[PDB]
């Protein structure tokens, strides 16, 4: 009870007559609220995963991605990708992570070779034409494509690298067609003993086993945070509540406050209104372009007004400069409550009779213990 | 007299953060010693008047 709180605050088992300060009151946030402009520049991932024709892997396509929202809600919540894995980030956490550049690398391979695309792997694709760095922090995405990329006679349009002089560095696209030397002889002309053309085309047919089937491979990649964050996940938003104390975030501006409809008119380029002491006192809603006053949530010292301990245990509480409508958010039973110019006074009986000032409260009010 | 003032030393020094408040706890009595001083000033504005 408030008397026990004064005994604890005064570190005494008995308290003399007077008024004593105690732990400050503050109206709590009723709920949290996040406001961000409704999503519009969603990334061009249709131009990746739903492009009609893919490239061959020996000369795998690169698409650069920039200035967009890297939404994966349709991506990672679809079972339609048969192997989608990430290699230095959780695929769930991508919506709360930023990038800087992005690249999509797009190509077709055999189903026995999707395992070679992973960082730190080997086999003629990974060795000769498409190697990830061993520290690859991004993701590989792949899907079974026998209904798409097979041809009834074998889809020999889709080509791979069958030979190379040396096994390659990260993302080293090679467009050379010059003849490979399998033996110690020089290779001269287009063909000869131990000469091989460095490529071959895959036999993708509707009949093939779960291995000789085609798969469409994409790698999503990024070099991180050396520069402004030109690609990032979708900043979500929640309903706009008013006339209640709440924890807001508006376009990155945090605070806890009461939000109200403002009469202030901004010019179009502004978002935060400030007061003399460089504190925020208003904000624009990103999605509705109207101005909200920000007001700090009601708070005050709590003073306990008491006759002395042995005299009596009965006490009254003053919520300094709090309107009596707001104190019941916390003695909230009331029935003897008096809004004073000094604050909401709870548990003291208002008597019209003016006596001499005994215990001060403020703004002409005093309190005393009487019949 | 002058305008009576009082501060919640924690709300100033640590506005709406428990993480800051639990660090402020490392410093002991200063957030009370400051209020004893300001309440002494405030009580004397009535006395002077």
């Amino acid at each position: 009870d408030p008397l026990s709180e004064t005994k604890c605050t005064l570190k005494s088992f008995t308290v003399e007559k007077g008024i004593y300060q105690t732990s400050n009151f503050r109206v709590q946030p009723t709920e949290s609220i996040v406001r961000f402009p409704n999503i519009t520049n969603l990334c061009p991932f249709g131009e990746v995963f739903n492009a009609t024709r893919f490239a061959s892997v020996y000369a795998w396509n690169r698409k650069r991605i920039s200035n967009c929202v890297a939404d994966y809600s349709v991506l990672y919540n679809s079972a339609s990708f048969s192997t989608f894995k990430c290699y230095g980030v959780s695929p769930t956490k991508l919506n709360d992570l930023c990038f800087t550049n992005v690249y999509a690398d797009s190509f077709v391979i055999r189903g026995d070779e999707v395992r070679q695309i992973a960082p730190g792997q080997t086999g003629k694709i990974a060795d000769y034409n498409y190697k990830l760095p061993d520290d690859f922090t991004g993701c590989v995405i792949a899907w079974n494509s026998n209904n798409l990329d097979s041809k009834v006679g074998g889809n020999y349009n889709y080509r791979y690298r069958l030979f190379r002089k040396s096994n390659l560095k990260p993302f080293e696209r090679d467009i050379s067609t010059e003849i490979y030397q399998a033996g110690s002889k020089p290779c001269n002309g287009v063909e000869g003993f131990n000469c091989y053309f460095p490529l071959q085309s895959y036999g993708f047919q509707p009949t093939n086993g779960v291995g000789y089937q085609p798969y469409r491979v994409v790698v999503l990649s990024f070099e991180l945070l050396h520069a402004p964050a030109t690609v990032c996940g979708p900043k979500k938003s929640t309903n706009l509540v008013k006339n209640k104390c709440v924890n807001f975030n508006f376009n990155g501006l945090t605070g806890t406050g009461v939000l109200t409809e403002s009469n202030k008119k901004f010019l179009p380029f502004q978002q935060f209104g400030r007061d003399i002491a460089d504190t925020t006192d208003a904000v624009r809603d990103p999605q509705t372009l109207e101005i909200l006053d920000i007001t700090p949530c009601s708070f005050g010292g709590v003073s306990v007004i008491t006759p002395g301990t042995n005299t009596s245990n009965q006490v009254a509480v003053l919520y300094q400069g709090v309107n009596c409508t707001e104190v019941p958010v916390a003695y909230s039973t009331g029935s003897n409550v008096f809004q004073t110019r000094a604050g909401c006074l709870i548990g003291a009986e208002h008597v019209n009779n003016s006596y001499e000032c005994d215990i001060p409260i403020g703004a002409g009010i005093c309190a005393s213990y009487q019949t | 007299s002058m305008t009576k003032t009082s501060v919640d030393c924690t709300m100033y020094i640590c506005g709406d953060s428990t993480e800051c408040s639990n660090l402020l706890l490392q410093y002991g009595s200063f957030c009370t010693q400051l209020n004893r001083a300001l309440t002494g000033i405030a009580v004397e504005q009535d006395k002077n008047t």
């Binding site: 300094q320 400069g321 002409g364 005093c366 | 030393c9 020094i13 008047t49």
Partner: peptide
Amino acid sequence: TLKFNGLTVLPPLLTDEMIAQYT
């Protein structure tokens, strides 16, 4: 010619009406 951030301004015990009466 004459609340934020935990700072508070408290009223004097005697109002400007009570000072006008003593005066």
